[PDB]
CSV table of C-alpha atoms in Angstrom, one decimal:
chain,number,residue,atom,x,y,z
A,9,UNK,CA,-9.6,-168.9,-58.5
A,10,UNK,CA,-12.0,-172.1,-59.4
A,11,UNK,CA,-15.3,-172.5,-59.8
A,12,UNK,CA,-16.0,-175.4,-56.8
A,13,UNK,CA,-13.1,-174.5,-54.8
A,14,UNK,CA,-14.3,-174.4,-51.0
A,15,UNK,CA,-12.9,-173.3,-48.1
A,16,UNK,CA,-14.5,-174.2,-44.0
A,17,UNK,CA,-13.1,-172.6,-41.2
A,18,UNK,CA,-14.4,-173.7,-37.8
A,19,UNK,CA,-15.1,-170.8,-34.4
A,20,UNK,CA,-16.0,-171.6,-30.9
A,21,UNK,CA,-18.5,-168.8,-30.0
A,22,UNK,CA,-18.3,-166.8,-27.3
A,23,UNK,CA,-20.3,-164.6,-24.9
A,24,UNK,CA,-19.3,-161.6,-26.6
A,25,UNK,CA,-20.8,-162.2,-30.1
A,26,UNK,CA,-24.2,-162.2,-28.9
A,27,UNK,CA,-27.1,-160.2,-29.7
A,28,UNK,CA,-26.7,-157.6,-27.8
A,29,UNK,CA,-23.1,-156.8,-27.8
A,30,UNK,CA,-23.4,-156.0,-31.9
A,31,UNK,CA,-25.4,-152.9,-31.0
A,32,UNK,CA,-24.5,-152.1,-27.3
A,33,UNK,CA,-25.7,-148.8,-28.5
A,34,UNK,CA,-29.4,-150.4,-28.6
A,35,UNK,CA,-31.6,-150.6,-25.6
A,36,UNK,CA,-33.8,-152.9,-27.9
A,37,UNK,CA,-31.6,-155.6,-27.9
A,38,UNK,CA,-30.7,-155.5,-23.9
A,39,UNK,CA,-33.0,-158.8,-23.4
A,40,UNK,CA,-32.1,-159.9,-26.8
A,41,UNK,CA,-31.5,-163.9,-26.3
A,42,UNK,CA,-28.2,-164.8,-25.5
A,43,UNK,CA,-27.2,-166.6,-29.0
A,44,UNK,CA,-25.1,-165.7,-31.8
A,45,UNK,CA,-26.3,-162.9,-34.2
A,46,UNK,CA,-26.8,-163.2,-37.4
A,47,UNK,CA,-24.7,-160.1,-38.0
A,48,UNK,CA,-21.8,-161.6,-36.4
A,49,UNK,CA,-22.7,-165.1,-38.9
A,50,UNK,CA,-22.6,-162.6,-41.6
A,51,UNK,CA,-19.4,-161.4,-40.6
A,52,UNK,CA,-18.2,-165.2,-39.9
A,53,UNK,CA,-19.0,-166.3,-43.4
A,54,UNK,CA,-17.8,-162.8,-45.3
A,55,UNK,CA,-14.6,-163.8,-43.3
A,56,UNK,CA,-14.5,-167.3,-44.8
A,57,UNK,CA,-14.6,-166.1,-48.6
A,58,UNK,CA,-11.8,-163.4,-47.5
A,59,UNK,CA,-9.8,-166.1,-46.4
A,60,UNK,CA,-10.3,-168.0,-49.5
A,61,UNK,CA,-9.6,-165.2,-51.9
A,62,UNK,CA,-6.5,-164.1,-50.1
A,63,UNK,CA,-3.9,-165.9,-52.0
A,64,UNK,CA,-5.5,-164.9,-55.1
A,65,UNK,CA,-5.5,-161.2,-54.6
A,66,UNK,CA,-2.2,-159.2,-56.1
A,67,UNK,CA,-0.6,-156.5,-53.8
A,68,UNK,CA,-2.7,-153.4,-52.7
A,69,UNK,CA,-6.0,-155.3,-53.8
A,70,UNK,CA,-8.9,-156.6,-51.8
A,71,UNK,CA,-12.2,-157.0,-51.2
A,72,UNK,CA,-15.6,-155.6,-50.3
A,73,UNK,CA,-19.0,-157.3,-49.7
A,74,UNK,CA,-21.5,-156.6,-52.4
A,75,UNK,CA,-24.6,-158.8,-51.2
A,76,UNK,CA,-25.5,-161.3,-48.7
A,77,UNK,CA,-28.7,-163.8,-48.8
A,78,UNK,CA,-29.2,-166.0,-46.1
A,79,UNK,CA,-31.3,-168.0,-43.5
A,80,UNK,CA,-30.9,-168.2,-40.2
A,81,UNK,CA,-33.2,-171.0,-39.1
A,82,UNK,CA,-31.4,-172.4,-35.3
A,83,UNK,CA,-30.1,-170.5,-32.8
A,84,UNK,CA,-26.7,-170.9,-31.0
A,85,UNK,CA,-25.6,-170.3,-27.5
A,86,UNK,CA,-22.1,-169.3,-26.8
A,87,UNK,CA,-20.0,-172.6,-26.7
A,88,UNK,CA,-20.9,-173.8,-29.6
A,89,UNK,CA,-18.5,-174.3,-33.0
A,90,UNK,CA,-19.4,-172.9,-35.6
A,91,UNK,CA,-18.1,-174.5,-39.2
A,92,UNK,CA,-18.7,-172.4,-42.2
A,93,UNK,CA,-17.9,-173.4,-46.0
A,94,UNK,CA,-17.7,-171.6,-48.5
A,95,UNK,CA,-17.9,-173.2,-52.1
A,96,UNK,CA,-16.9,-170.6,-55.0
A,97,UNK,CA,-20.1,-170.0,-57.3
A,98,UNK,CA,-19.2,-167.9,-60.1
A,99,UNK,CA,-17.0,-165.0,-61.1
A,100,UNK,CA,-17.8,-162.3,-63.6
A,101,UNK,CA,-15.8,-159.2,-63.7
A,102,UNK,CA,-14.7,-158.2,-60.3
A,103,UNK,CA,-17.4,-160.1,-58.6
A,104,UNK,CA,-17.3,-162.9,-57.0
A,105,UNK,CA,-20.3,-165.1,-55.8
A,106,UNK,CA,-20.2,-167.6,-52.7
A,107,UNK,CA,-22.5,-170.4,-51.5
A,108,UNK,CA,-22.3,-169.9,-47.7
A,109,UNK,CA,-23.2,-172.5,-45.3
A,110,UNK,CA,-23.0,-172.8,-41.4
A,111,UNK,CA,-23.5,-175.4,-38.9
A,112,UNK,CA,-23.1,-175.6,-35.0
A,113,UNK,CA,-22.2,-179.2,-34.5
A,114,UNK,CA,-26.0,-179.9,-33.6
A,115,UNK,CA,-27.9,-178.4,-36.2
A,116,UNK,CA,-27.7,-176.2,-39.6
A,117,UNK,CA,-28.1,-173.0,-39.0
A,118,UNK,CA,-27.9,-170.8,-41.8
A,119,UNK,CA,-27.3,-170.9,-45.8
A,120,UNK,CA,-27.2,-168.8,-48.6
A,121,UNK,CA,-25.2,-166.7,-51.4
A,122,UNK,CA,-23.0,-164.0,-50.7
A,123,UNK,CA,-21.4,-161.5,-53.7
A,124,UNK,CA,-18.0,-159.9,-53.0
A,125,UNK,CA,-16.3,-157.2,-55.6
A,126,UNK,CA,-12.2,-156.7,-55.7
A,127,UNK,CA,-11.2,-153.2,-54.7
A,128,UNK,CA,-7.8,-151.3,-55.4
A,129,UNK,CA,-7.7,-150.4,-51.9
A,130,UNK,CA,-5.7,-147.5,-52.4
A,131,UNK,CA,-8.1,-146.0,-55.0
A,132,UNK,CA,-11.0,-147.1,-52.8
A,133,UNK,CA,-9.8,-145.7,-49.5
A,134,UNK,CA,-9.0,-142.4,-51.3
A,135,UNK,CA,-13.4,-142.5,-52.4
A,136,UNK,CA,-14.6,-142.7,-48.9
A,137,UNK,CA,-12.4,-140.1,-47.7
A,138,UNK,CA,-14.1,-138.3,-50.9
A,139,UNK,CA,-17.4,-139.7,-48.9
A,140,UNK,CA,-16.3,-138.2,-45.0
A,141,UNK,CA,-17.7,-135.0,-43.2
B,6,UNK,CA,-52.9,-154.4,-28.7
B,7,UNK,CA,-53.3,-153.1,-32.1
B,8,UNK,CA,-52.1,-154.9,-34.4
B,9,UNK,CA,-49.4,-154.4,-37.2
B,10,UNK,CA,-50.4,-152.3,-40.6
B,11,UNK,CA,-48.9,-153.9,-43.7
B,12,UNK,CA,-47.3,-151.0,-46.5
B,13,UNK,CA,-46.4,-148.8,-43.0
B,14,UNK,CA,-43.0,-147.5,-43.0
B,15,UNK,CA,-40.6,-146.9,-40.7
B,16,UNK,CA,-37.3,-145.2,-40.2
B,17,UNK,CA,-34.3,-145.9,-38.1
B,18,UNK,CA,-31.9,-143.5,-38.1
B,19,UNK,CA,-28.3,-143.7,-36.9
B,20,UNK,CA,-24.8,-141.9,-37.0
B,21,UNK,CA,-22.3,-144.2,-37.8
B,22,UNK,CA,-19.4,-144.3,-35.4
B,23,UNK,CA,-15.7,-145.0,-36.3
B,24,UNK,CA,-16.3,-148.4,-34.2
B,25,UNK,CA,-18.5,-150.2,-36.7
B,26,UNK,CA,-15.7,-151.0,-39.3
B,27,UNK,CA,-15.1,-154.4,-40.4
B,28,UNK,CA,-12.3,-154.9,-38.0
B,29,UNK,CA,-14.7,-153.8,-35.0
B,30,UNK,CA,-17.1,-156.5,-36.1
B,31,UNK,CA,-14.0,-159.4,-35.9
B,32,UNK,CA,-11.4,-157.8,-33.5
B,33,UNK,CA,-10.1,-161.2,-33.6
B,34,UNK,CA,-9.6,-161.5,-37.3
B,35,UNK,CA,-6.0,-160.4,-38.6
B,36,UNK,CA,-7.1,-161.2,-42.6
B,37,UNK,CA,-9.5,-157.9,-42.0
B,38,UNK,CA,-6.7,-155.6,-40.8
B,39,UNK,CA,-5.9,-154.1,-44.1
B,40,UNK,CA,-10.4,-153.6,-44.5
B,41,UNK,CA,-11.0,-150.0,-45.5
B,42,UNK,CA,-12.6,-148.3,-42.4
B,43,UNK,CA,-16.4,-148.1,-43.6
B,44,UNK,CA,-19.8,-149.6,-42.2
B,45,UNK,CA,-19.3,-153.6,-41.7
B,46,UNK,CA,-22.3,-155.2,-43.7
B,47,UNK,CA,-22.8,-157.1,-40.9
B,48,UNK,CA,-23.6,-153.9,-38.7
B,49,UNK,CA,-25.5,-152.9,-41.7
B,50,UNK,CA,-27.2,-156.0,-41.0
B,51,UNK,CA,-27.9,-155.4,-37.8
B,52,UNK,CA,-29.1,-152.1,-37.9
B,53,UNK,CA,-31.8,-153.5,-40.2
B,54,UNK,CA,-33.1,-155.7,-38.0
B,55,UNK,CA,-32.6,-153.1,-35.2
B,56,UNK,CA,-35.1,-151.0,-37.7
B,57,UNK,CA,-37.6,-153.7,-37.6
B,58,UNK,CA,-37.3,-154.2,-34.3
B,59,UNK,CA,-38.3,-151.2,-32.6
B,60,UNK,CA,-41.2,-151.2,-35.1
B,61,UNK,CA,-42.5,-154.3,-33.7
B,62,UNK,CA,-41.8,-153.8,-30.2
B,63,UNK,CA,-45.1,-151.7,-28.9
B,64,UNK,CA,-47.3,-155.2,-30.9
B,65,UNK,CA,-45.5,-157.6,-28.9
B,66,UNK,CA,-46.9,-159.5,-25.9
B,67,UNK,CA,-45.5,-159.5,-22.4
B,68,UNK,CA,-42.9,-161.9,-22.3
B,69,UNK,CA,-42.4,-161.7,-26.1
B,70,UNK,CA,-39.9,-160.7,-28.9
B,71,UNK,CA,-38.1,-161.9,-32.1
B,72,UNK,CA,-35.4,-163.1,-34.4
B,73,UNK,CA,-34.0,-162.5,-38.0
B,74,UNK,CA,-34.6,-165.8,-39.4
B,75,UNK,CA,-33.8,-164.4,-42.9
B,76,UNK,CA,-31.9,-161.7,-44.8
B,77,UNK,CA,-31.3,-161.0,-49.0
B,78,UNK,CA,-29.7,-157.5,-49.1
B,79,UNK,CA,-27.5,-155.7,-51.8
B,80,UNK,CA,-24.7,-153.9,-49.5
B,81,UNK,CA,-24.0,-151.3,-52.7
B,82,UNK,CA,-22.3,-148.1,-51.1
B,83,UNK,CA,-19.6,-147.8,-48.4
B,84,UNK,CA,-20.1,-145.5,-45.3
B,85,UNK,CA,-17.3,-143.7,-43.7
B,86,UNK,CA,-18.0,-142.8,-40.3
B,87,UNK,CA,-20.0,-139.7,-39.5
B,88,UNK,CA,-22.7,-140.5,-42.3
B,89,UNK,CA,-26.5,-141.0,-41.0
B,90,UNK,CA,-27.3,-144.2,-42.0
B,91,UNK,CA,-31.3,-143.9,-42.3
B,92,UNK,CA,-32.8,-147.8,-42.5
B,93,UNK,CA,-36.6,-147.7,-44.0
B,94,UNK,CA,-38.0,-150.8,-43.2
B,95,UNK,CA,-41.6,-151.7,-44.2
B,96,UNK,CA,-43.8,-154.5,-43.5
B,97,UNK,CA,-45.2,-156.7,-46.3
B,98,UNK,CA,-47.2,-159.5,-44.2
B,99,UNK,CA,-47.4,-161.2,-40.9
B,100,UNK,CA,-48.7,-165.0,-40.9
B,101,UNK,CA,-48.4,-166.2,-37.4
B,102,UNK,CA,-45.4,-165.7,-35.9
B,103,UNK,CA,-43.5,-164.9,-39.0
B,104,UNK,CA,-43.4,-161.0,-40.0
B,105,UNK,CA,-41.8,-160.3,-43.7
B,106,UNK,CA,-40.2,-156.8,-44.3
B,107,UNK,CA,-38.8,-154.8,-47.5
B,108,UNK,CA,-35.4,-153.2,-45.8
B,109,UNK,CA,-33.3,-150.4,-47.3
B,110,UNK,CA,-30.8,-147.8,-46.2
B,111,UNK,CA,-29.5,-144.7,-47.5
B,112,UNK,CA,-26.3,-142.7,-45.8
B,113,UNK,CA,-27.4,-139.0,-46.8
B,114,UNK,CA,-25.4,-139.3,-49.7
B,115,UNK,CA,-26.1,-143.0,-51.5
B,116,UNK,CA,-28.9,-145.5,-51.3
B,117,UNK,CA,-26.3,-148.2,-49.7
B,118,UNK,CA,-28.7,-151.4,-50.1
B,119,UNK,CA,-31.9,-152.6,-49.9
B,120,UNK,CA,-33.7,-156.2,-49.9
B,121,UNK,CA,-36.0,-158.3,-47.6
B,122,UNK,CA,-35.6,-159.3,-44.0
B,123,UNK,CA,-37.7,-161.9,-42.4
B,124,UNK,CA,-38.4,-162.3,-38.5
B,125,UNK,CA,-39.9,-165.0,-36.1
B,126,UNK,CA,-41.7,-163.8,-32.7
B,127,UNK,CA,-41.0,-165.6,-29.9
B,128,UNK,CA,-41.2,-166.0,-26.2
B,129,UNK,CA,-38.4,-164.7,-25.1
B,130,UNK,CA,-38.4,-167.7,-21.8
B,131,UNK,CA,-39.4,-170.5,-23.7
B,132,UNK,CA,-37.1,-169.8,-26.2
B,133,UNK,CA,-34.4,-170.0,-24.0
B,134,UNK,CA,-35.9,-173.1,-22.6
B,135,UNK,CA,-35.1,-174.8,-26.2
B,136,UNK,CA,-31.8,-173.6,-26.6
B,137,UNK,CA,-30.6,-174.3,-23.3
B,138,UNK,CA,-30.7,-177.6,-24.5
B,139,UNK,CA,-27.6,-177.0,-27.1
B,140,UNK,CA,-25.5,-174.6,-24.4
C-alpha cells in the first residue's frame, strides 16, 4: 500500500446518526442537538481507511483502530453529505497512519490523523474471548 | 452556580453491551461485517464525551449545553462485551466557552486509552438557530 494513496467516500446523513441515538442509553444526550456526532464521524472516517486497506489485506487478516486525533469544528444536520478522504501517512510495522478529512458540502468539519494496526483475526478473536466474563 | 474546579476528576462508568460493536456503530456498512465483536472506538468516543458531559451539566445555564469540538485518544485495548468500561475524565482549563479535558478509560482489566478531549458550550436554541441554516 503507498505512501499518498487516498481514498473519499461520500454519505448522506441521516436522522439516525445523531447525537443522541449513539447513546440511547444516555438521558444526557436526550436534548443533545440534532447534528451528526462525532462518534458516528469517527466511525465514518475509520470506515474510509478500512475501505482503502481492503484489497491490501491477505485472507483471515484485518484491522483494528489504534488512535484517532481530530477536530470537529461545524456541525451537520441530517441531510447533509458527508465526503471523507483519507490520504495514507505512513506505515511502520503493522501500523498504519491516516490523514482524515471531512466536509459537508458547506463547510469543513473535521480533520486529523487516525492510526490503525493489522490483526490475524482469528488469533485476535480467540484474545478477547480470553478477555470475556 | 459554582463554577468548574480544574485537576477535579470524574468517573463514568458503564457495562458494555454486546450492541456497541463496530458493526452496531455502521449497521449499514458490509466492509465491517467480518469486525471482531469488541467496543467500537467511536462508542469509546462517545462515552468520553458522555463522561464530560455529565460533569459539566449541574455548571451549565438554563438553556445551555455543549459539543466535542476536539478529540486525540490512543484506543489501545479491545473490550468484549460485559467489561465495565470506567472513563476518568478531568478538567485541565475553561477559557470562555471552551472547556479542555485529560480523558482515559480502563475496562477492569486494561487501561484501553487515554488522551485529551475538548468541548464548546452553547445555547442549545441559538445553536440550532445557526445550523438550521445548513438543514
Amino acid at each position: 500500500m503507498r505512501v499518498g494513496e487516498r481514498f473519499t467516500h461520500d454519505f448522506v446523513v441521516p436522522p439516525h446518526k445523531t447525537v443522541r441515538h449513539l447513546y440511547p442509553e444516555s438521558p444526557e444526550f436526550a436534548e443533545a442537538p440534532e447534528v451528526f456526532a462525532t462518534g458516528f464521524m469517527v466511525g465514518l472516517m475509520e470506515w474510509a481507511c478500512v475501505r482503502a486497506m481492503a484489497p491490501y489485506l491477505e485472507p483471515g487478516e484485518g484491522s483494528l483502530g489504534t488512535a484517532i486525533c481530530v477536530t470537529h469544528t461545524a456541525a451537520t444536520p441530517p441531510g447533509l453529505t458527508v465526503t471523507v478522504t483519507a490520504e495514507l501517512r505512513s506505515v511502520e510495522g503493522r501500523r498504519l497512519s491516516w490523514r482524515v478529512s471531512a466536509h459537508d458540502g458547506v463547510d469543513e468539519i473535521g480533520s486529523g490523523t487516525h492510526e490503525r494496526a493489522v490483526i490475524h483475526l482469528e488469533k485476535f478473536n480467540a484474545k478477547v474471548r480470553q478477555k470475556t466474563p
